[PDB]
């Protein structure tokens, strides 16, 4: 699926080593299915792939 | 019969009393600080509300 014209948001940012940030997405999908996600800046690691 | 009142019906910043352990009761006077170490599995993540 397409995913654009979506928004991102933090709601819970825990500033730390443990997975604590959260953020929702707005997802904005044209199929439905799975999609890999990535911060191609390395500011941000993520658990979910 | 020529006495005096008494404290718990004279005292100020609002008590009672007993002949018990000599206490006095409720006295709703000033400000406490109070700080709780909360066990963290009544949390819940905030993912979740």
Known sequence: PTVSDLECKITECTYASDFGGIATVAYKSSKAGNCPIHSPSGVAVIKEN | RDKGAPLNDVAPFGCSIALEPLRA?????????????????????????
């Open chain 2, 25 to 49: 009761e409720n006295c709703a006077v000033g400000s406490i600080p109070i700080s709780i170490d909360i066990p963290d599995a009544a949390f819940t993540r905030i993912s979740e509300t």
